């Protein structure tokens, strides 16, 4: 919906960056669950502890990394 209203140009606009970013953060989010499900299937007690660990990390990792990008993005395009 966004892409089909931006004036046609053939160089990377700032919004185009911010779109691909969100596209990545959701791609990684859907990817994170795939890793968790993969290691959780193992019956060993250690792998279960790692599966739970990956979740607990991402619970606060992603909001941090996005906030990092958030800072980087606006500072780059706040001129």
Interacting residues toward its own copies by CB under 8 A: 1, 3-5, 8-12, 16-17, 20, 23-24, 27, 30-31, 34, 37-38, 41
Whole-number Cα distances in Å, 32 to 3, 12, 22, 52: 27, 28, 15, 12
Note whether 6 and 21 are within 8 A (CB). Answer: no
Report in angstroms how near the CB of residue 1 gets to its own copies at its nearest: 6
Q: Return the number of the residue (10 or 75) whose C-beta is nearest its own copies.
A: 10
Q: Return the number of the residue (11 or 56) whose C-beta is nearest its own copies.
A: 11
């Amino acid at each position: 919906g966004i892409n089909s209203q931006l004036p046609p140009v053939s160089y990377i606009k700032a919004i185009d960056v911010w779109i691909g970013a969100c596209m990545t953060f959701i791609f990684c989010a859907l990817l994170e669950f795939a890793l968790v499900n993969h290691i959780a299937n193992a019956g060993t007690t250690e792998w279960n502890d790692i599966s739970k660990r990956v979740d607990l990390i991402s619970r606060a990792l992603f909001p941090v990394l996005f906030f990092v990008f958030n800072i980087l993005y606006w500072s780059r395009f706040g001129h």
